[PDB]
Design a protein around this ligand. Structure first.
Ligand SMILES: NC[C@@H]1O[C@H](O[C@H]2[C@@H](O)[C@H](O[C@@H]3[C@@H](O)[C@H](N)C[C@H](N)[C@H]3O[C@H]3O[C@H](CO)[C@@H](O)[C@H](O)[C@H]3N)O[C@@H]2CO)[C@H](N)[C@@H](O)[C@@H]1O
Ligand SMILES: [Mg+2]
Ligand SMILES: [Mg+2]
Ligand SMILES: [Mg+2]
Ligand SMILES: [Mg+2]
Ligand SMILES: [Mg+2]
Ligand SMILES: [Mg+2]
Ligand SMILES: [Mg+2]
Ligand SMILES: [Mg+2]
Ligand SMILES: [Mg+2]
Ligand SMILES: [Mg+2]
Ligand SMILES: [Mg+2]
Ligand SMILES: [Mg+2]
Ligand SMILES: [Mg+2]
Ligand SMILES: [Mg+2]
Ligand SMILES: [Mg+2]
Ligand SMILES: [Mg+2]
Ligand SMILES: [Mg+2]
Ligand SMILES: [Mg+2]
Ligand SMILES: [Mg+2]
Ligand SMILES: [Mg+2]
Ligand SMILES: [Mg+2]
Ligand SMILES: [Mg+2]
Ligand SMILES: [Mg+2]
Ligand SMILES: [Mg+2]
Ligand SMILES: [Mg+2]
Ligand SMILES: [Mg+2]
Ligand SMILES: [Mg+2]
Ligand SMILES: [Mg+2]
Ligand SMILES: [Mg+2]
Ligand SMILES: [Mg+2]
Ligand SMILES: [Mg+2]
Ligand SMILES: [Mg+2]
Ligand SMILES: [Mg+2]
Ligand SMILES: [Mg+2]
Ligand SMILES: [Mg+2]
Ligand SMILES: [Mg+2]
Ligand SMILES: [Mg+2]
Ligand SMILES: [Mg+2]
Ligand SMILES: [Mg+2]
Ligand SMILES: [Mg+2]
Ligand SMILES: [Mg+2]
Ligand SMILES: [Mg+2]
Lengths: 130, 199, 106, 190, 170, 291
RNA sequence: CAUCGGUUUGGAGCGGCAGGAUAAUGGCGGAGGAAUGUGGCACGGCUUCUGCUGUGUGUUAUAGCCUCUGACGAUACUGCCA
RNA sequence: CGAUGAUUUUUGCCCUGCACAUUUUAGAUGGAUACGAAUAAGACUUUAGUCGCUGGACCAUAGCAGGCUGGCAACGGUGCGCUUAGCGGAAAGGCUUUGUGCGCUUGCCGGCGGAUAGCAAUGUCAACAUGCGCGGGGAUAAAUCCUUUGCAUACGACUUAG
């Protein structure tokens, strides 16, 4: 055999899902340059953006033709169910938990501390015998 | 952005002047800084150019008495110190106090061999230079200009890394055991409540 | 309670100044954890105390305080301008100040 | 111009197993193994199959594209070094003074000992690189055979032998004496 | 930051000539004050008219027809160097006709040190056919199934110090 | 304008400053580089300059006009009674240079070496090294612990030895104590050799053989304050020069408006530390030999 | 501390109105066209056709795109809000 | 800058435990939270899954600046004091560890206390240094002037001897 280690990059291709502004999802519909792409999405405005302003996700929207219009992008996004695919990843889960933590109140933080005390007691009890 | 009692920076892979300016402004603002592994610092530009630059620096000396002139320090830590001091009003009492807030070393001597070293992304060579550019390691320039203890430092750094590797293997084993204990106490009332809170 | 702090950590950085002339009547303060004028705008109007130690006792206490207040933001990285009852002495450059949470508007 | 993508295709013969991980190429063949580190170049590798490897440069400028086919050629030279070997033949050129060449061993090291070069009392010694074999040709008078798997070491040892026999303070157009590389081929004839 | 303007003007009517011909120009200007200034600059380069003897008739913004359709534009230029006057032709990929001109102005500033005052835009044409594309540096983006990664990603940090090793995966 | 003629400089800039040595005992700045494969042996010895003499020797130098022919040569006699080993020092390789880790001493020190640590011996209670001598109490485990530390951590091992100056005709009673680097063998071998040689005499015949080439470290003859003419070998000024002639006429150009460090000036001459190399050993004599 | 008055710096500020190609887009409907030709089909190299793939063909099929257009509905930008 | 010898029969010196009072502080106010290496690559958990896309993390965090008492569940956690063993010389002066004793435990539940500092005023709580009282262990010097020397020297200084 050969056993060549290949790069696991994310590629700039028609159908790549990207995060914009740490809030919204979008997909690449056509490549402008090494630096610029045309993006579209159900909850975003179809626009030409610089690749520095977006982050490629490991997700590809399969079978998206180059230059697809807003209707095609929305229809294929609904078919591929990109929102559910995103929401199941540890990245989106970490973002959601960060938001949830940011919405806690002082009383909820106090309760968090109390629950941490109880769980640490249980964890030490489990750890000493295992 | 937090204020730390001491910030210990691992100097490996850092560009000399960007780290120097950042550390100067940090110590001027009352922050204590320790820089370790100054022999692993980086300067942009090929090695020969920096050797020529250091020889231009060496050219400069007080004519009537060489003992009064610039003192060309050959150690990597002293090169970083010169870079920083050029960025400080060192002839005032305030600059003197700011410089007292700073320490620079070759290698990682005690007690810092068992403490946390951080990096400075705004000054990292691997993140700043274009991927084709050539760079210099300050340890090789120092040996090339008179620093005598390169092989002593590399012998002691290999010894430190052997001990530091044993540390990590112990920490990974105890981290694995605690995770198995945290897995047992999962799906408990505290864990379910902590999951609704985001923890 | 291992912690008892009721103030935000700050640092006395500088006076308001040009290249060569300094203005002691305005101090530049770095609030800990603040990195933008939007974050720093939460702290506008909050009173500031500089707490220091002195040789002579006053009413049995050797601790004296100079009080101030936040007036405006400064620049783009979350520094603020402060106005103290008595100007902060220049030797306090790099010394820590206390950013009080009052007058509170939460 | 920042060419968007440039590719080269390595071809791996049947008995050869290239092996690449983090720009460290280890080529294995019937004749042995050779290794080379490429951390000074920005290239990426894709295994098309067991007989072909794609070597790619993405968004590379003129010089960075130029550094791609040299990577291809170096790995190909490794492959033919581990499947056919390398052989350089040197001819001894002298007008009057015979060149006395011996293969000696001092201090546990192999050396090529050149004596009487242009009548000099000086004894020239060239260290023989590891993995390089020297032989005094029997079928040919005044011939040295330098052989080995690595083309770089063999050609550099040959160059060492050639460089140590330079003529000083004379018209080198007339005084053509020296030891020169006459043939650059392979151990296995083709 | 530019806009495309339609500026129409004419000579002031005389009793000899009461309806002078109306001339339109397409001007890429940041605002209408520079748009009407550039108009008179080129008419006095072509026609016997002045701002004192003329009249601006209309200024209207020309919006992109399909601002979210990726196009390739060919721009014909006439620029002044330190030594002479030269004609050049270049090609740009962008979604707006204006955005190709903004790249063009940045581009001739960077490779030829040509300032805005030294440049005349003769023509901007959208290349409908892929055979209309003459330049390689934009033709290389018209290949089928174009994919490429972005190796060596550098992440901008909000904090001065980071407690974990830097990475460039992407 | 330039000098009318180009002459070489007066004196060497590699022996500045021409000041007095900090100590009268010359100190070995650098020792021979250590080779593990050699046997454990000393690299230095201390002696006293007795005087000069003359020898006659048949020369063995092919191609010389004096080959196999008698030559008359000046020679120097160095009185070298055996030295006594009293201590050992360990040195550790550090990123700041060699650093002394520990010094271990012998149980008994002779009076001549205990006088080394005193300026007024006759007025003293002579308390030096008495508690340390007590450190050897019935098990001497403190000494063994320090020696094990030296074996474990030291990279350079040097012995401490003193001359037996009471065997010389000098009226001085203070011995001269110096560190002599130990070369050969492992660190453990050096430490065992040093410990086993405590309170023992070591002779010159165990350090130097005949026909060897050795170096000499010493402080030269003092001459006190000297003028430039003899201190630096400068040209005497003409006989008819006002205010004297044993001077340097021009001590600098107008600019730099300072006196340069390279100009010859009057000052203290001699009593300098010098290292002189490649002196051949014609004879290692023995005091017990009647010939 | 509260409230006021004068001056002033702001907010991820909120709302109403007007203008423009009575924005241009986009979405929906209809008509036409091409290729960086989708499905299909025909030859191949590796696949027990395991996003197989290359090339040819051709015009919506098991993707789509471009142009024109018909009736609505928005938004950007900019002004004004006593 | 290091190693090492000796350190005032003085009410003087060293080490140490407590206790107190002072001067100083370039500026405590939960925690300086320890692999290495690469980056056209990496981690983890077994070449395949997961991870990153920042520390908005992790640990710690409840109790008159944290009081007085009582009870369960567990046999854990932690502070301090002896104590066991091992490792660390790059500036180790720290990192572990055995047994034991005295506390606390907020893992959970009870009973009692805080007011008046009056609507804020740092509303005083830390470590470095020095001195002083006790208690305990411990040791009991030199250098200079002077005379002398001449390996030295203008005088200081230097090599000697007393
Ligand atoms: N699943 C829908 C698919 O639509 C595709 O076909 C699409 C195109 O061929 C067709 O072309 C354009 C379209 O791009 C554009 N966005 C709208 C325009 N009205 C369409 O035009 C065409 O389709 C419409 C019906 O939609 C017809 O009324 C009209 O006559 C025809 N020229 O619009 C169709 C629908 O968007 C597939 N080729 C077809 O096999 C399939 O039905
Ligand atoms: Mg620790
Ligand atoms: Mg030097
Ligand atoms: Mg204080
Ligand atoms: Mg010549
Ligand atoms: Mg000639
Ligand atoms: Mg690192
Ligand atoms: Mg002259
Ligand atoms: Mg030396
Ligand atoms: Mg010690
Ligand atoms: Mg010690
Ligand atoms: Mg004299
Ligand atoms: Mg004399
Ligand atoms: Mg004289
Ligand atoms: Mg005269
Ligand atoms: Mg006079
Ligand atoms: Mg008002
Ligand atoms: Mg007001
Ligand atoms: Mg409107
Ligand atoms: Mg429309
Ligand atoms: Mg068409
Ligand atoms: Mg097809
Ligand atoms: Mg409309
Ligand atoms: Mg409308
Ligand atoms: Mg508006
Ligand atoms: Mg208004
Ligand atoms: Mg006090
Ligand atoms: Mg990593
Ligand atoms: Mg994991
Ligand atoms: Mg693994
Ligand atoms: Mg594995
Ligand atoms: Mg994997
Ligand atoms: Mg963490
Ligand atoms: Mg932790
Ligand atoms: Mg209790
Ligand atoms: Mg218990
Ligand atoms: Mg100590
Ligand atoms: Mg110590
Ligand atoms: Mg600890
Ligand atoms: Mg107050
Ligand atoms: Mg108190
Ligand atoms: Mg208290
Ligand atoms: Mg004297």
């Amino acid at each position: 055999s050969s056993t060549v280690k290949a790069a696991n990059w994310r590629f700039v291709e028609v159908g790549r899902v990207v995060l914009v502004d740490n809030k919204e999802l979008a997909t690449i519909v056509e490549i402008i340059d090494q630096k610029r792409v045309l993006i579209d999405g159900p909850k975003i405005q179809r626009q030409a953006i610089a690749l520095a302003k977006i982050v490629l996700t490991p997700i590809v929207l399969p079978n998206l033709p180059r230059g697809s219009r807003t209707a095609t992008v929305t229809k294929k996004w609904a078919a591929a169910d990109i929102d559910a695919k995103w929401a199941a990843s540890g990245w989106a889960k970490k973002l959601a938990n960060k938001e949830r933590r940011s919405q806690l109140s002082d009383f909820e933080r106090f309760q968090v501390m109390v629950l941490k005390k109880q769980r640490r007691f249980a964890t030490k009890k489990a750890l000493v015998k295992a | 952005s937090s204020f730390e009692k001491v910030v210990v920076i691992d100097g490996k892979g850092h560009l000399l002047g960007r780290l120097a300016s950042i550390v100067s402004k940090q110590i001027l603002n009352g922050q204590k800084v320790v820089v370790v592994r100054c022999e692993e610092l980086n300067i942009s530009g090929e090695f020969f150019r920096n050797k020529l630059k250091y020889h231009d620096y060496l050219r400069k000396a007080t004519r009537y008495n060489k003992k009064k002139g610039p003192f060309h320090f050959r150690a990597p830590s002293r090169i970083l110190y010169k870079a920083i001091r050029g960025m400080i009003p060192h002839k005032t009492a305030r600059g003197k106090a700011a410089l007292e807030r700073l320490k620079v070393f070759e290698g990682v001597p005690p007690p810092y061999d068992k403490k946390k070293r951080v990096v400075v992304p705004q000054a990292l060579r691997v993140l700043r230079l274009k991927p084709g550019r050539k760079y210099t390691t300050v340890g090789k320039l120092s040996s090339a200009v008179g620093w005598k203890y390169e092989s002593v430092v590399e012998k002691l750094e290999e010894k430190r890394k052997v001990q530091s590797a044993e540390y990590y293997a112990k920490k990974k084993a105890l981290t694995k055991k605690l995770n198995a204990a945290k897995a047992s106490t999962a799906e408990s009332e505290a864990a379910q409540k902590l999951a609704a809170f985001g923890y | 309670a291992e912690s008892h702090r009721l103030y935000v950590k700050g640092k006395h950085i500088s006076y308001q100044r040009s290249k060569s002339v300094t203005n002691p009547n305005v101090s530049l303060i770095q609030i800990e954890g603040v990195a933008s004028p939007k974050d720093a705008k939460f702290y506008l109007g909050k009173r500031i105390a500089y707490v220091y130690r002195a040789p002579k006792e006053i009413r049995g206490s050797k601790i004296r305080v100079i009080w101030g207040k936040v007036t405006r933001t400064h620049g783009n990285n979350g520094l603020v301008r402060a106005n103290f009852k008595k100007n902060l002495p220049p030797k306090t450059f790099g010394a820590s100040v206390r950013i009080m949470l009052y007058p509170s508007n939460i | 111009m920042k060419y968007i993508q440039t590719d080269q295709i390595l071809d791996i013969p049947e008995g050869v197993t290239v092996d690449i991980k983090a720009r460290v190429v280890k080529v294995t063949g019937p004749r042995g193994e050779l290794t080379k580190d490429l951390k000074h170049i920005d290239v990426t590798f894709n295994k098309i199959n067991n007989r072909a490897i794609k070597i790619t440069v993405h968004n590379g400028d003129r010089k960075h594209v130029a550094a791609l086919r040299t990577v291809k050629s170096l790995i190909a030279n490794l492959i033919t070094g581990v499947t056919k070997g390398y052989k350089y033949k040197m001819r001894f050129v002298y007008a009057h003074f015979p060149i006395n060449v011996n293969i000696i061993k001092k201090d546990g090291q192999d050396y090529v000992e050149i004596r009487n070069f242009l009548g000099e009392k000086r004894v020239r010694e060239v260290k023989i690189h590891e993995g390089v074999t020297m032989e005094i040709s029997s079928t040919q008078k005044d011939e040295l055979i330098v052989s080995g798997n690595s083309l770089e070491a063999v050609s550099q040892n040959a160059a060492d032998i050639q460089q140590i026999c330079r003529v000083r303070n004379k018209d080198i157009r007339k005084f053509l004496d020296g030891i020169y590389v006459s043939e650059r081929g392979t151990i296995v004839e083709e | 930051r530019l806009n495309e303007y339609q500026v129409i003007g004419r000579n002031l009517p005389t009793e000899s000539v009461p309806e002078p011909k109306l001339f339109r120009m397409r001007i890429f200007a940041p605002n209408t004050v520079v748009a009407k200034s550039r108009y008179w600059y080129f008419l006095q380069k072509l026609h016997k008219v002045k701002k004192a003897s003329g009249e601006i008739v209309s200024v209207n913004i020309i919006s992109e027809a399909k601002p979210t359709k990726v196009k390739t534009f060919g721009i014909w230029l006439r620029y002044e160097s330190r030594s002479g006057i030269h004609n050049m032709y270049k090609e740009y990929r962008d979604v707006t006709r204006v955005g190709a001109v903004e790249t063009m102005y940045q581009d001739l500033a960077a490779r030829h040190r040509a300032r805005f005052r030294s440049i005349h835009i003769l023509k901007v044409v959208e290349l409908e056919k892929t055979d209309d594309v003459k330049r390689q540096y934009v033709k290389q983006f018209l290949t089928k199934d174009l994919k490429f990664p972005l190796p060596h990603r550098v992440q901008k940090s909000k904090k001065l110090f980071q407690a974990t090793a830097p990475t460039t995966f992407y | 304008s330039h000098r009318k003629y180009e002459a070489p400089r007066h004196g060497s800039l590699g022996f500045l400053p021409r000041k007095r040595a900090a100590k009268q005992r010359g100190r070995v700045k650098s020792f021979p580089k250590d080779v593990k494969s050699k046997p454990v042996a000393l690299t230095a010895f201390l002696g006293y300059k007795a005087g000069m003499t003359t020898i006659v020797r048949d020369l063995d130098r092919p191609g010389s006009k004096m080959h196999k022919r008698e030559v008359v040569e000046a020679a120097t006699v160095v009185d070298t009674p055996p030295m006594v080993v009293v201590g050992v020092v360990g040195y550790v390789e550090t990123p700041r240079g060699l650093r002394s880790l520990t010094t271990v001493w012998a149980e008994h020190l002779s009076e001549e070496v205990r006088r080394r640590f005193y300026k007024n011996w006759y007025k003293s209670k002579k308390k030096a090294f008495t508690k340390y001598s007590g450190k050897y109490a019935t098990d001497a485990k403190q000494v063994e612990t320090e020696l094990a530390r030296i074996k474990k951590y030291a990279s350079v091992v040097r012995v401490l030895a003193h001359t037996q100056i009471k065997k010389t005709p000098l009226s001085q009673k203070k011995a001269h104590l110096a560190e002599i680097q130990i070369n050969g063998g492992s660190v453990s071998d050096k430490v065992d050799w040093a410990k086993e040689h405590f309170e023992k005499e070591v002779s010159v015949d165990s350090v130097f053989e005949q026909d060897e080439m050795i170096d000499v470290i010493a402080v030269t003859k003092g001459h006190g304050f000297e003028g430039v003419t003899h201190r630096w070998g400068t040209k005497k000024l003409p006989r008819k020069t006002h205010r004297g002639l044993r001077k340097v006429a021009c001590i600098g150009a107008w600019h730099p408006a300072n006196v340069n460090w390279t100009v010859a000036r009057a000052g203290q001459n001699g009593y300098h530390h010098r290292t002189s190399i490649n002196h051949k050993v014609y004879r290692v004599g023995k005091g017990t030999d009647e010939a």
